[PDB]
Design an enzyme around this catalytic site. Structure first.
Site, PDB file in Angstrom:
ATOM      1  N   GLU A  11       0.808  -1.192   0.000  1.00 43.10           N
ATOM      2  CA  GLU A  11       0.000   0.000   0.000  1.00 43.10           C
ATOM      3  C   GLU A  11       0.855   1.260   0.000  1.00 43.10           C
ATOM      4  OE1 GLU A  11      -3.237   0.214  -0.406  1.00 43.10           O
ATOM      5  OE2 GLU A  11      -4.027  -1.668   0.154  1.00 43.10           O
ATOM      6  N   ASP A  20      -6.416   6.826  -5.093  1.00 46.85           N
ATOM      7  CA  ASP A  20      -5.841   5.477  -5.108  1.00 46.85           C
ATOM      8  C   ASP A  20      -5.873   4.988  -6.573  1.00 46.85           C
ATOM      9  OD1 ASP A  20      -8.429   4.503  -5.598  1.00 46.85           O
ATOM     10  OD2 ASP A  20      -8.621   3.591  -3.696  1.00 46.85           O
ATOM     11  N   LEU A  32      -8.806   4.368   2.742  1.00 47.13           N
ATOM     12  CA  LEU A  32      -9.819   4.958   1.875  1.00 47.13           C
ATOM     13  C   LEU A  32     -10.666   6.022   2.598  1.00 47.13           C
ATOM     14  CD1 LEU A  32     -11.487   5.207  -0.742  1.00 47.13           C
ATOM     15  CD2 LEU A  32     -13.027   3.414   0.177  1.00 47.13           C
ATOM     16  N   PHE A 104      -8.654  -6.147   3.526  1.00 47.30           N
ATOM     17  CA  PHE A 104      -8.185  -4.785   3.607  1.00 47.30           C
ATOM     18  C   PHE A 104      -8.335  -4.037   2.268  1.00 47.30           C
ATOM     19  CE2 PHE A 104      -5.532  -1.902   6.103  1.00 47.30           C
ATOM     20  CZ  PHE A 104      -5.074  -1.021   5.111  1.00 47.30           C
ATOM     21  N   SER A 117     -13.004 -19.684  -5.333  1.00 49.16           N
ATOM     22  CA  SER A 117     -11.647 -19.578  -4.780  1.00 49.16           C
ATOM     23  C   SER A 117     -11.661 -19.923  -3.306  1.00 49.16           C
ATOM     24  CB  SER A 117     -11.126 -18.145  -4.872  1.00 49.16           C
ATOM     25  OG  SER A 117     -10.973 -17.756  -6.204  1.00 49.16           O
TER      26      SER A 117
END
Ligand SMILES: [Cl-]
Ligand SMILES: [Cl-]
Length: 162
Positions: A11, A20, A32, A104, A117
């Protein structure tokens, strides 16, 4: 290596409001602020998040305090979520880190949408999970970061970050 170091790598740290990879106002370590196009709406979310008049800039301490809160919130979001918790409980410690990274990044609603998944991760089919995780907007928008997280799920090591 640990989740805090992983996320700091993926990040970065910026002390001034920035947009972003999606164009959203963001500050600190991937915190954010708002999806609104208004820089004024972002500053006002920033002052509220920090408890003072920031004028769009924060110190390192404050960035790290937001970071700590967001990691904690990502974890607690995983544990309250009925789709996420069983998968998480089933993983070893390195691959738990990778699940926190994804949450996150994209929120628990996002990750909970990776149904197939999740099922493969739960069955410990590492290579097939990696292939399936790769077929996603997430991988196509941020491939470098997505590969690092995918490798972590595939190998159960910190290699991609070393
Ligand atoms: Cl906040
Ligand atoms: Cl990337």
């Amino acid at each position: 290596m640990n989740i805090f170091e992983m996320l700091r790598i993926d990040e970065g740290l910026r002390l001034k409001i920035y947009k972003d990879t999606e164009g959203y106002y963001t500050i600190g370590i991937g915190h954010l602020l708002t999806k609104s196009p208004s820089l004024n709406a972002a500053k006002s979310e920033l002052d509220k998040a920090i408890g003072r008049n920031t004028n769009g800039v924060i110190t390192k301490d404050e960035a790290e305090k937001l970071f700590n809160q967001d990691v904690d919130a990502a974890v607690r979001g995983i544990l309250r979520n009925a789709k996420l918790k069983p998968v998480y409980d089933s993983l070893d410690a390195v691959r738990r880190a990778a699940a926190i990274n994804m949450v996150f990044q994209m929120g628990e609603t996002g990750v909970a949408g990776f149904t197939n998944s999740l099922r493969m991760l739960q069955q410990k089919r590492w290579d097939e999970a990696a292939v399936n995780l790769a077929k996603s907007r997430w991988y196509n928008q941020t491939p470098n970061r997505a590969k690092r997280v995918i490798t972590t799920f595939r190998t159960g090591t910190w290699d991609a970050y070393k």
